[PDB]
Amino acid sequence: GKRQTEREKKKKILAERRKVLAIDHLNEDQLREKAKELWQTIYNLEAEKFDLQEKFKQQKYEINVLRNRINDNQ
Amino acid sequence: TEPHAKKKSKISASRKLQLKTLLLQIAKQELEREAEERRGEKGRALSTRAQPLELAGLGFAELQDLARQLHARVDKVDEERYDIEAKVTKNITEIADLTQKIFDLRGRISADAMMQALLGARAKES
Amino acid sequence: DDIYKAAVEQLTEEQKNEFKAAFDIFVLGAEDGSISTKELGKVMRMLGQNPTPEELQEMIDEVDEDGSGTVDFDEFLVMMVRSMGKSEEELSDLFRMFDKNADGYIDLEELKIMLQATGETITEDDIEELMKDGDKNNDGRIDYDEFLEFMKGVE
Ligand SMILES: [Ca+2]
Ligand SMILES: [Ca+2]
Ligand SMILES: [Ca+2]
Protein backbone atom coordinates (compact mmCIF):
# COMPACT_ATOMS: atom_id res chain seq x y z
CA GLY A 1 0.00 0.00 0.00
CA LYS A 2 1.35 3.39 1.13
CA ARG A 3 4.44 1.87 2.83
CA GLN A 4 6.20 0.40 -0.22
CA THR A 5 5.73 3.67 -2.14
CA GLU A 6 7.23 5.68 0.76
CA ARG A 7 10.13 3.22 0.85
CA GLU A 8 10.88 3.26 -2.90
CA LYS A 9 10.59 7.07 -2.91
CA LYS A 10 13.11 7.22 -0.03
CA LYS A 11 15.51 4.89 -1.88
CA LYS A 12 15.13 6.97 -5.07
CA ILE A 13 15.77 10.36 -3.43
CA LEU A 14 18.81 9.11 -1.46
CA ALA A 15 20.23 7.49 -4.65
CA GLU A 16 19.92 10.81 -6.53
CA ARG A 17 21.72 12.70 -3.72
CA ARG A 18 24.63 10.22 -3.47
CA LYS A 19 28.04 11.31 -4.86
CA VAL A 20 30.62 9.00 -6.49
CA LEU A 21 33.75 8.55 -4.39
CA ALA A 22 36.77 8.45 -6.74
CA ILE A 23 40.01 8.50 -4.76
CA ASP A 24 42.24 6.07 -6.65
CA HIS A 25 44.50 8.72 -8.23
CA LEU A 26 44.96 10.83 -5.06
CA ASN A 27 48.19 11.02 -3.05
CA GLU A 28 48.41 11.16 0.76
CA ASP A 29 47.98 14.95 0.94
CA GLN A 30 44.93 14.91 -1.38
CA LEU A 31 43.43 12.04 0.67
CA ARG A 32 43.74 14.11 3.88
CA GLU A 33 41.88 16.92 2.15
CA LYS A 34 39.30 14.47 0.78
CA ALA A 35 38.72 13.20 4.34
CA LYS A 36 38.24 16.81 5.59
CA GLU A 37 35.74 17.43 2.77
CA LEU A 38 33.71 14.32 3.69
CA TRP A 39 33.81 15.29 7.36
CA GLN A 40 32.43 18.73 6.44
CA THR A 41 29.63 17.06 4.47
CA ILE A 42 28.73 14.93 7.52
CA TYR A 43 28.86 18.07 9.70
CA ASN A 44 26.51 19.98 7.35
CA LEU A 45 24.10 17.02 7.19
CA GLU A 46 24.09 16.74 11.00
CA ALA A 47 23.46 20.52 11.22
CA GLU A 48 20.48 20.19 8.83
CA LYS A 49 19.19 17.21 10.85
CA PHE A 50 19.40 19.34 14.01
CA ASP A 51 17.41 22.18 12.39
CA LEU A 52 14.70 19.69 11.32
CA GLN A 53 14.49 18.21 14.82
CA GLU A 54 13.98 21.72 16.23
CA LYS A 55 11.33 22.44 13.55
CA PHE A 56 9.56 19.16 14.37
CA LYS A 57 9.23 20.21 18.04
CA GLN A 58 7.82 23.65 17.16
CA GLN A 59 5.42 21.90 14.74
CA LYS A 60 4.10 19.58 17.51
CA TYR A 61 3.45 22.64 19.64
CA GLU A 62 1.66 24.38 16.75
CA ILE A 63 -0.44 21.30 15.99
CA ASN A 64 -1.46 21.00 19.66
CA VAL A 65 -2.59 24.65 19.70
CA LEU A 66 -4.54 24.19 16.42
CA ARG A 67 -6.27 21.10 17.84
CA ASN A 68 -7.22 23.01 20.99
CA ARG A 69 -8.56 25.96 18.92
CA ILE A 70 -10.64 23.58 16.80
CA ASN A 71 -12.02 21.77 19.89
CA ASP A 72 -12.88 25.09 21.62
CA ASN A 73 -14.57 26.51 18.51
CA GLN A 74 -16.68 23.48 17.61
CA THR B 1 -32.01 39.87 25.25
CA GLU B 2 -32.09 42.58 27.93
CA PRO B 3 -29.55 45.37 28.52
CA HIS B 4 -26.66 44.80 30.97
CA ALA B 5 -23.81 46.72 32.62
CA LYS B 6 -20.84 47.86 30.56
CA LYS B 7 -17.48 46.30 31.35
CA LYS B 8 -15.68 48.66 33.74
CA SER B 9 -11.96 48.70 34.53
CA LYS B 10 -9.92 49.81 37.56
CA ILE B 11 -7.13 50.81 35.15
CA SER B 12 -7.29 53.10 32.12
CA ALA B 13 -7.23 51.74 28.57
CA SER B 14 -4.18 53.96 28.15
CA ARG B 15 -2.43 52.01 30.95
CA LYS B 16 -3.46 48.64 29.45
CA LEU B 17 -2.03 49.69 26.07
CA GLN B 18 1.30 50.64 27.68
CA LEU B 19 1.40 47.27 29.48
CA LYS B 20 0.54 45.33 26.29
CA THR B 21 3.28 47.18 24.37
CA LEU B 22 5.85 46.30 27.05
CA LEU B 23 4.54 42.71 27.09
CA LEU B 24 5.18 42.35 23.35
CA GLN B 25 8.66 43.84 23.74
CA ILE B 26 9.71 41.35 26.40
CA ALA B 27 8.16 38.42 24.47
CA LYS B 28 10.32 39.53 21.53
CA GLN B 29 13.41 39.58 23.79
CA GLU B 30 12.57 36.07 25.00
CA LEU B 31 12.27 34.95 21.35
CA GLU B 32 15.79 36.27 20.61
CA ARG B 33 17.02 34.60 23.83
CA GLU B 34 15.48 31.29 22.71
CA ALA B 35 17.25 31.56 19.33
CA GLU B 36 20.63 32.28 20.96
CA GLU B 37 20.19 29.33 23.35
CA ARG B 38 19.23 27.07 20.43
CA ARG B 39 22.40 28.13 18.55
CA GLY B 40 24.43 27.18 21.64
CA GLU B 41 22.59 23.86 21.86
CA LYS B 42 23.26 23.23 18.15
CA GLY B 43 27.02 23.82 18.66
CA ARG B 44 27.13 21.27 21.50
CA ALA B 45 25.04 18.68 19.62
CA LEU B 46 27.37 18.98 16.62
CA SER B 47 30.43 18.49 18.91
CA THR B 48 29.04 15.10 19.90
CA ARG B 49 27.56 13.92 16.60
CA ALA B 50 30.37 15.07 14.29
CA GLN B 51 33.62 14.84 16.25
CA PRO B 52 36.95 16.07 14.64
CA LEU B 53 39.16 13.89 12.41
CA GLU B 54 42.43 12.46 13.69
CA LEU B 55 44.66 12.32 10.58
CA ALA B 56 48.14 12.47 12.14
CA GLY B 57 50.02 9.21 11.71
CA LEU B 58 47.68 7.61 9.16
CA GLY B 59 49.52 6.21 6.17
CA PHE B 60 48.35 6.09 2.58
CA ALA B 61 46.25 2.91 2.83
CA GLU B 62 44.76 4.06 6.17
CA LEU B 63 43.71 7.33 4.44
CA GLN B 64 42.06 5.45 1.58
CA ASP B 65 40.10 3.37 4.14
CA LEU B 66 39.15 6.48 6.14
CA ALA B 67 37.75 8.19 3.00
CA ARG B 68 35.66 5.08 2.32
CA GLN B 69 34.52 4.99 5.97
CA LEU B 70 33.54 8.69 5.89
CA HIS B 71 31.73 8.30 2.59
CA ALA B 72 29.72 5.43 4.07
CA ARG B 73 28.88 7.64 7.08
CA VAL B 74 27.69 10.39 4.70
CA ASP B 75 25.12 7.84 3.37
CA LYS B 76 23.91 6.89 6.85
CA VAL B 77 23.57 10.47 8.13
CA ASP B 78 21.69 11.47 4.92
CA GLU B 79 19.25 8.61 5.56
CA GLU B 80 18.68 9.78 9.17
CA ARG B 81 18.17 13.37 7.92
CA TYR B 82 15.68 12.10 5.35
CA ASP B 83 13.68 10.33 8.09
CA ILE B 84 13.29 13.44 10.24
CA GLU B 85 12.55 15.49 7.07
CA ALA B 86 9.73 13.07 6.21
CA LYS B 87 8.12 13.65 9.62
CA VAL B 88 8.47 17.43 9.17
CA THR B 89 6.80 17.15 5.75
CA LYS B 90 3.83 15.21 7.21
CA ASN B 91 3.48 17.85 9.93
CA ILE B 92 3.30 20.58 7.26
CA THR B 93 0.40 18.74 5.58
CA GLU B 94 -1.37 18.49 8.95
CA ILE B 95 -0.73 22.15 9.83
CA ALA B 96 -2.09 23.29 6.44
CA ASP B 97 -5.27 21.19 6.92
CA LEU B 98 -5.91 22.32 10.54
CA THR B 99 -5.30 25.96 9.57
CA GLN B 100 -8.02 25.70 6.94
CA LYS B 101 -10.34 23.98 9.46
CA ILE B 102 -9.96 26.65 12.15
CA PHE B 103 -10.37 29.43 9.57
CA ASP B 104 -13.73 27.89 8.55
CA LEU B 105 -14.92 27.38 12.14
CA ARG B 106 -13.96 31.00 12.94
CA GLY B 107 -15.76 32.27 9.77
CA ARG B 108 -17.94 54.76 5.13
CA ILE B 109 -17.44 58.42 6.09
CA SER B 110 -14.68 59.62 8.42
CA ALA B 111 -15.48 61.55 11.63
CA ASP B 112 -13.60 64.50 10.03
CA ALA B 113 -15.91 64.79 7.04
CA MET B 114 -18.92 64.07 9.22
CA MET B 115 -17.99 66.81 11.69
CA GLN B 116 -17.43 69.38 8.92
CA ALA B 117 -20.83 68.57 7.37
CA LEU B 118 -22.88 68.54 10.58
CA LEU B 119 -21.23 71.47 12.40
CA GLY B 120 -19.63 73.63 9.68
CA ALA B 121 -17.51 76.41 11.20
CA ARG B 122 -18.21 75.10 14.74
CA ALA B 123 -15.93 72.15 13.92
CA LYS B 124 -12.40 73.36 14.72
CA GLU B 125 -10.74 70.95 17.16
CA SER B 126 -12.25 67.77 15.69
CA ASP C 1 -11.66 47.96 21.46
CA ASP C 2 -8.72 48.75 23.76
CA ILE C 3 -6.77 50.93 21.28
CA TYR C 4 -9.96 52.91 20.48
CA LYS C 5 -10.84 53.37 24.15
CA ALA C 6 -7.33 54.75 24.77
CA ALA C 7 -7.74 57.26 21.91
CA VAL C 8 -11.05 58.37 23.52
CA GLU C 9 -9.33 58.89 26.92
CA GLN C 10 -6.86 61.23 25.22
CA LEU C 11 -9.46 63.41 23.48
CA THR C 12 -9.40 67.01 24.72
CA GLU C 13 -12.42 68.56 26.37
CA GLU C 14 -13.05 70.87 23.39
CA GLN C 15 -12.89 67.84 21.04
CA LYS C 16 -15.43 66.04 23.22
CA ASN C 17 -17.59 69.17 23.31
CA GLU C 18 -17.67 69.27 19.49
CA PHE C 19 -18.55 65.55 19.37
CA LYS C 20 -21.37 66.23 21.86
CA ALA C 21 -22.77 68.91 19.53
CA ALA C 22 -22.73 66.30 16.69
CA PHE C 23 -24.31 63.67 18.97
CA ASP C 24 -27.15 66.11 19.75
CA ILE C 25 -27.98 66.30 16.00
CA PHE C 26 -28.15 62.51 15.82
CA VAL C 27 -30.40 62.09 18.82
CA LEU C 28 -32.73 65.01 18.20
CA GLY C 29 -36.26 63.74 18.88
CA ALA C 30 -35.23 60.29 20.13
CA GLU C 31 -37.40 58.82 22.92
CA ASP C 32 -34.47 57.67 25.12
CA GLY C 33 -31.77 60.26 24.19
CA SER C 34 -29.85 57.54 22.36
CA ILE C 35 -29.02 56.73 18.72
CA SER C 36 -31.10 53.87 17.24
CA THR C 37 -30.97 52.61 13.60
CA LYS C 38 -33.74 55.13 12.90
CA GLU C 39 -31.63 58.16 13.91
CA LEU C 40 -28.42 56.68 12.51
CA GLY C 41 -30.08 56.00 9.13
CA LYS C 42 -31.61 59.48 8.98
CA VAL C 43 -28.23 61.12 9.54
CA MET C 44 -26.30 58.81 7.21
CA ARG C 45 -28.78 59.61 4.42
CA MET C 46 -28.59 63.32 5.23
CA LEU C 47 -24.83 62.87 4.76
CA GLY C 48 -25.33 61.30 1.32
CA GLN C 49 -24.82 57.65 2.29
CA ASN C 50 -27.27 54.81 1.67
CA PRO C 51 -26.62 52.04 4.25
CA THR C 52 -28.87 48.99 4.40
CA PRO C 53 -30.70 48.23 7.66
CA GLU C 54 -28.17 45.42 8.21
CA GLU C 55 -25.18 47.76 7.80
CA LEU C 56 -26.88 50.19 10.22
CA GLN C 57 -27.44 47.47 12.82
CA GLU C 58 -23.81 46.34 12.42
CA MET C 59 -22.52 49.92 12.91
CA ILE C 60 -24.42 50.07 16.22
CA ASP C 61 -23.40 46.55 17.37
CA GLU C 62 -19.70 47.37 16.86
CA VAL C 63 -19.74 49.90 19.72
CA ASP C 64 -22.77 48.88 21.80
CA GLU C 65 -21.36 48.01 25.23
CA ASP C 66 -24.53 47.53 27.29
CA GLY C 67 -26.55 45.57 24.66
CA SER C 68 -29.09 48.40 24.47
CA GLY C 69 -29.25 48.17 20.67
CA THR C 70 -28.56 51.92 20.77
CA VAL C 71 -25.57 54.28 20.91
CA ASP C 72 -25.11 56.60 23.92
CA PHE C 73 -22.55 59.43 23.95
CA ASP C 74 -19.73 57.31 25.38
CA GLU C 75 -20.31 54.68 22.70
CA PHE C 76 -20.53 57.52 20.14
CA LEU C 77 -16.99 58.69 21.01
CA VAL C 78 -15.71 55.17 20.30
CA MET C 79 -17.66 55.14 17.01
CA MET C 80 -15.97 58.46 16.04
CA VAL C 81 -12.39 57.35 16.81
CA ARG C 82 -12.99 53.99 15.06
CA SER C 83 -13.99 55.92 11.94
CA MET C 84 -10.47 57.40 11.74
CA GLY C 85 -0.29 46.17 14.70
CA LYS C 86 1.70 42.95 14.27
CA SER C 87 0.90 40.16 11.77
CA GLU C 88 -0.81 36.95 12.94
CA GLU C 89 2.38 34.96 12.24
CA GLU C 90 4.40 37.37 14.38
CA LEU C 91 1.81 37.20 17.20
CA SER C 92 1.81 33.40 17.00
CA ASP C 93 5.57 33.29 17.80
CA LEU C 94 5.10 35.77 20.67
CA PHE C 95 2.15 33.75 22.06
CA ARG C 96 4.45 30.72 22.43
CA MET C 97 6.76 32.87 24.61
CA PHE C 98 3.94 33.61 27.07
CA ASP C 99 2.85 29.96 27.12
CA LYS C 100 5.56 28.65 29.44
CA ASN C 101 4.06 25.21 30.14
CA ALA C 102 3.28 24.80 26.39
CA ASP C 103 -0.42 23.92 26.94
CA GLY C 104 -1.79 26.31 24.28
CA TYR C 105 -3.21 28.81 26.83
CA ILE C 106 -1.88 31.80 28.73
CA ASP C 107 -2.89 31.44 32.40
CA LEU C 108 -2.74 33.98 35.24
CA GLU C 109 0.66 32.79 36.52
CA GLU C 110 2.18 33.05 33.03
CA LEU C 111 0.68 36.52 32.57
CA LYS C 112 2.06 37.58 35.98
CA ILE C 113 5.57 36.31 35.15
CA MET C 114 5.54 38.22 31.84
CA LEU C 115 4.22 41.42 33.45
CA GLN C 116 6.89 41.42 36.18
CA ALA C 117 9.60 40.90 33.55
CA THR C 118 8.60 44.25 31.98
CA GLY C 119 10.18 46.17 34.89
CA GLU C 120 7.11 48.37 35.42
CA THR C 121 5.50 48.40 38.89
CA ILE C 122 2.79 45.74 38.60
CA THR C 123 -0.23 46.08 40.90
CA GLU C 124 -2.73 43.25 41.49
CA ASP C 125 -5.24 45.41 39.57
CA ASP C 126 -2.89 45.49 36.54
CA ILE C 127 -2.93 41.70 36.44
CA GLU C 128 -6.65 41.09 37.08
CA GLU C 129 -7.84 43.70 34.55
CA LEU C 130 -5.52 42.59 31.75
CA MET C 131 -6.71 38.98 32.20
CA LYS C 132 -10.37 40.07 32.23
CA ASP C 133 -9.66 42.21 29.13
CA GLY C 134 -8.09 39.21 27.34
CA ASP C 135 -10.31 36.37 28.55
CA LYS C 136 -13.53 36.70 26.49
CA ASN C 137 -15.11 33.36 27.39
CA ASN C 138 -14.57 33.57 31.18
CA ASP C 139 -12.41 30.46 31.64
CA GLY C 140 -9.68 32.59 33.30
CA ARG C 141 -7.14 32.08 30.52
CA ILE C 142 -6.21 33.60 27.19
CA ASP C 143 -6.34 31.25 24.23
CA TYR C 144 -4.70 31.90 20.87
CA ASP C 145 -7.73 33.61 19.26
CA GLU C 146 -8.25 35.74 22.40
CA PHE C 147 -4.57 36.69 22.35
CA LEU C 148 -4.87 37.96 18.75
CA GLU C 149 -7.82 40.21 19.68
CA PHE C 150 -6.04 41.20 22.93
CA MET C 151 -2.97 42.40 21.01
CA LYS C 152 -4.83 43.81 17.97
CA GLY C 153 -3.18 47.11 16.98
CA VAL C 154 -0.44 46.82 19.62
CA GLU C 155 2.93 48.09 18.30
CA1 LIG D 1 -25.73 51.07 24.03
CA1 LIG E 1 0.11 27.87 29.43
CA1 LIG F 1 -10.44 32.43 27.62
From Swiss-Prot, chain A:
The modification Phosphothreonine is found at T5. Keywords: Acetylation, Cardiomyopathy, Disease variant, Muscle protein, Phosphoprotein. Signal peptide: none annotated. The keyword DNA repair does not apply. One of its GO terms (cellular component) is striated muscle thin filament. Heart. The fetal heart shows a greater expression in the atrium than in the ventricle, while the adult heart shows a greater expression in the ventricle than in the atrium. Isoform 6 predominates in normal adult heart. Isoforms 1, 7 and 8 are expressed in fetal heart. Isoform 7 is also expressed in failing adult heart. It comes from the Eukaryota. One of its GO terms (molecular function) is identical protein binding. GO terms for biological process: cardiac muscle contraction; muscle filament sliding; negative regulation of ATP-dependent activity; positive regulation of ATP-dependent activity; regulation of heart contraction; regulation of muscle contraction; response to calcium ion; ventricular cardiac muscle tissue morphogenesis. Troponin T is the tropomyosin-binding subunit of troponin, the thin filament regulatory complex which confers calcium-sensitivity to striated muscle actomyosin ATPase activity. It is linked to Cardiomyopathy, familial hypertrophic, 2: A hereditary heart disorder characterized by ventricular hypertrophy, which is usually asymmetric and often involves the interventricular septum. The symptoms include dyspnea, syncope, collapse, palpitations, and chest pain. They can be readily provoked by exercise. The disorder has inter- and intrafamilial variability ranging from benign to malignant forms with high risk of cardiac failure and sudden cardiac death. Cardiomyopathy, dilated, 1D: A disorder characterized by ventricular dilation and impaired systolic function, resulting in congestive heart failure and arrhythmia. Patients are at risk of premature death. This is Troponin T, cardiac muscle. It comes from Homo sapiens (Human). The gene is TNNT2.
Swiss-Prot record, chain B:
One of its GO terms (biological process) is heart development. The keyword Phosphoprotein applies. Phosphorylated at Ser-12 and Ser-14 by PRKCE; phosphorylation increases myocardium contractile dysfunction. Phosphorylated preferentially at Thr-1. Phosphorylation by STK4/MST1 alters its binding affinity to TNNC1 (cardiac Tn-C) and TNNT2 (cardiac Tn-T). The modification Phosphothreonine is found at T1, T21, T48, T99. The record marks A50, A67 as: Involved in TNI-TNT interactions. Keywords: Acetylation, Actin-binding, Cardiomyopathy, Disease variant, Muscle protein, Phosphoprotein. It comes from the Eukaryota. The keyword Transmembrane does not apply. The modification Phosphoserine is found at S12, S14, S47, S110, S126. One of its GO terms (molecular function) is actin binding. Signal peptide: none annotated. Disulfide bonds: none annotated. Binds to actin and tropomyosin. Interacts with TRIM63. Interacts with STK4/MST1. This is Troponin I, cardiac muscle.
Swiss-Prot record, chain C:
One of its GO terms (cellular component) is troponin complex. Ca(2+) 2 binds at D99, N101, D103, Y105, E110. It is linked to Cardiomyopathy, dilated, 1Z: A disorder characterized by ventricular dilation and impaired systolic function, resulting in congestive heart failure and arrhythmia. Patients are at risk of premature death. Cardiomyopathy, familial hypertrophic, 13: A hereditary heart disorder characterized by ventricular hypertrophy, which is usually asymmetric and often involves the interventricular septum. The symptoms include dyspnea, syncope, collapse, palpitations, and chest pain. They can be readily provoked by exercise. The disorder has inter- and intrafamilial variability ranging from benign to malignant forms with high risk of cardiac failure and sudden cardiac death. Ca(2+) 1 binds at D64, D66, S68, T70, E75. It comes from Homo sapiens (Human). The modification Phosphoserine is found at S92. The keyword Repeat applies. Keywords: Acetylation, Calcium, Cardiomyopathy, Disease variant, Metal-binding, Muscle protein, Phosphoprotein, Repeat. GO terms for biological process: cardiac muscle contraction; diaphragm contraction; muscle filament sliding; regulation of ATP-dependent activity; regulation of muscle contraction; regulation of muscle filament sliding speed; response to metal ion; skeletal muscle contraction. InterPro entries: CALM/Myosin/TropC-like (IPR050230), EF-hand-dom_pair (IPR011992), EF_Hand_1_Ca_BS (IPR018247), EF_hand_dom (IPR002048). PROSITE patterns: EF_HAND_1, EF_HAND_2. One of its GO terms (molecular function) is calcium ion binding. Troponin is the central regulatory protein of striated muscle contraction. Tn consists of three components: Tn-I which is the inhibitor of actomyosin ATPase, Tn-T which contains the binding site for tropomyosin and Tn-C. The binding of calcium to Tn-C abolishes the inhibitory action of Tn on actin filaments. Residues 15-50, 51-84, 86-121, 122-155 form the EF-hand domain. Ca(2+) 3 binds at D135, N137, D139, R141, E146. It holds the Pfam family EF-hand_7. SMART domains: EFh. It comes from the Eukaryota.
